[PDB]
Structure 1
Amino acid sequence: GAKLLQILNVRVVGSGERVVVLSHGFGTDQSAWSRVLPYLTRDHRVVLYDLVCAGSVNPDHFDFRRYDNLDAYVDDLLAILDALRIPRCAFVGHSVSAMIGILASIRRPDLFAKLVLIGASPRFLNDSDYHGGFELEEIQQVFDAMGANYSAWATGYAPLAVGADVPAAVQEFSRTLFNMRPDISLHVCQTVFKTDLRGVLGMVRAPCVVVQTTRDVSVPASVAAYLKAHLGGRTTVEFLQTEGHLPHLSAPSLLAQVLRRALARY
């Protein structure tokens, strides 16, 4: 509870009866929301927090055993909302936080009135008749690079993830990626790559907006379609008219339009 609010840098800003949680992805912290935030705070009470793996959290809180599955990140989210006494919210999750929000919405359907998923996938690895975008041998090599030379890996990865040639966004994403402890960064990647949410998507009861960009290195277009086909609530796909995996960094004004629409009623 209380200690958790401090450890994970929880901030509540804005005001309103429509509560929105913004939950960041891999390689960033809650500062990734800074350019979308002013579009939301007149209208909504906004809860921000850092995942335990963020470089902005003291890394000695990272318990490798506890956080070897996403359910432990879910537990942290739920503990924060319970400590804040929030009974109902919308949840916006990027990347791993999209996965966390799917799981959280199944655990606590009363609490999650709507999900907005950005850069989201239920499964990165390819399977029989499922295209996730990644092969085992490919990711084995990346995980080796992450260990052998984290800094060179991160330098190469940041522009690929941003996608669009937006140097300020590359610099900003790099800043936070370099802030992650290397062993923690590898462990979150391993944990996410072993996660497969396909079977539980139909348990989601909340309406969902899947935000998809025109090219996302982590998320093939067919994954967005899979989510629309299999999530259990009323689901739509909103296509942004720019590319990248981190549109909150690279195209925040455009993303804010989608968020205002998705968060209007729930």
Structure 2
Amino acid sequence: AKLLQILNVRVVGSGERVVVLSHGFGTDQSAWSRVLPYLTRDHRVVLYDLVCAGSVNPDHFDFRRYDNLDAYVDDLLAILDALRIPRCAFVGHSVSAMIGILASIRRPDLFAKLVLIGASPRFLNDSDYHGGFELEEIQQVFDAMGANYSAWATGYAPLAVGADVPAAVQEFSRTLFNMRPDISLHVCQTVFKTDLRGVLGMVRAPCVVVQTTRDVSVPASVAAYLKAHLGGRTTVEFLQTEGHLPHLSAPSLLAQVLRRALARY
């Protein structure tokens, strides 16, 4: 109830098919603005901001509590329980794909289908596992975020967008610059400590994994890994463009995939 206000929860559209849109690091729910009109004639859509979003009052960010992703899952579940929603599809970008996987295991009754964008179960490399990052690399990232957050964000935004789409770079930069730098660092530390590989088989919901042709944070082999290990009926759907943020850089193309994936569940 209190969360509904604090996390800027909005319910738009209408339908018996309920869809939750959950954003990634460095954005807020406004990242969904261009795909949203493709969904609301057909679906009741629930949008909210993660507690770490710059659009949320940062004095709500309890560093102790949000030490791991279970606390973010708690928020999501509390929002849906407050709205009295018994069943939904969930679309999660980046860290929200991890949140969605965890939430679908905690409450399989509630999650009829997952759509995972910019998604990985583990960003750090391991033996025989290509996550895309090494420890020394993320250590330098963490130092850059502390030493000069604004310069770090300025350099990261075009790499995340990938394609040369200046409006998307400007928009992603806007919301990165809006995050409090200590909260940004903390979220990044939490995500890089997360490893969901062992629990993927506990997911029972059908899942669509969205793969773009290059993602700076998600190697091409990760989608096949998710398809091989997720416990529900899983497909990989391919976008014919690149980037980590296709909802910003190619929203009309992404919307095609979302309309198909959210048709029946």
TM-score category of the 2 structures, normalised to the smaller one: over 0.9
Deviation, structure 1 residue 110: 0.2
Could you tell me how far 1:221 is from its partner in structure 2? 0.7
Deviation at 1:22, TM superposition (A): 0.1
Structure 2 distance, partners of 1:189, 1:92, is: 20
Q: Partner of 2:88 in structure 1?
A: 89
Distance 2:43 2:166 in 1: 31
Aligned length: 265
Cα-to-partner distance string for 1:121-148 (whole Å, 9 max, x where unaligned): 0000000000000000000000000000
Q: CA offsets, 1:29-82, max 9 Å, x none?
A: 000000000000000000000000000000000000000100000000000000
Deviation at 1:149, TM superposition (A): 0.2
| TM superposition outliers: structure 1 runs of 4+ over 4 Å | none
C-alpha deviation, 1:215, in angstroms: 0.1
**Deviation of residue 11 (structure 1)?**
0.1
Give the Å deviation of 1:7. 0.1
**Counterparts of 1:65 and 1:221, CA distance in 2:** 34
Following the alignment from structure 2 to structure 1, what is the Cα–Cα distance between the partners of residues 59 and 16?
36
How far the C-alpha of 1:84 sits from its partner, in A, is 0.1
Distance 1:166 1:221 in 2: 21
Q: Does the residue aligned with 1:67 lie in a helix, a strand or coil?
A: helix
Tell me the secondary structure at the aligned position of residue 223 of structure 1.
helix
Partner SS for 2:89? strand
SS of the residue aligned with 1:211?
strand
Distance 2:221 2:229 in 1: 12
2:103 alignment partner in structure 1: 104
State the alpha-carbon separation in 2 of the partners of residues 155 and 242 from structure 1: 23
Query: Post-superposition shift, 1:12?
Result: 0.0
Task: Write the distance in 2 (CA, Å) between the matches of 1:6 and 1:229.
Answer: 39
Query: How far 1:13 moved relative to its partner?
Result: 0.1
Shift of 1:197: 0.2
Percent identical across equivalent pairs?
100
Partner secondary structure for residue 67 of structure 2: coil
3-state SS of 1:209 partner: strand
**In the TM superposition, what whole-angstrom CA distance separates every residue of 1:152-180 from its partner, at most 9, and x where no partner exists?**
00000000000000000000000000000
SS in 2 for 1:92: strand
Q: Gapped runs of 5+ residues in structure 1?
A: none
Q: Does residue 73 of the first structure (1) align with residue 72 of the second (2)?
A: yes
* Structure 1 residue matching 2:20: 3-state secondary structure: strand
Alpha-carbon offset, residue 259 of structure 1: 0.2
Give the secondary-structure state (helix, strand or coil) at the position aligned to 1:144: helix
In the alignment, the residues of structure 2 paired with residue 94 and residue 65 of structure 1 have an alpha-carbon distance, to the nearest angstrom, of 24
- State TM-score, norm by structure 1: 0.99
Paired with 1:109 and 1:242, the residues of 2 have a C-alpha distance of 33
- Structure 2 counterpart of 1:40: 39
Q: Which residue in the other structure is 2:190 paired with?
A: 191
Query: What SS does the aligned partner of 2:86 have?
Result: coil
Map of 2:127 onto structure 1 = 128
Q: Secondary structure at the match of 1:117?
A: strand
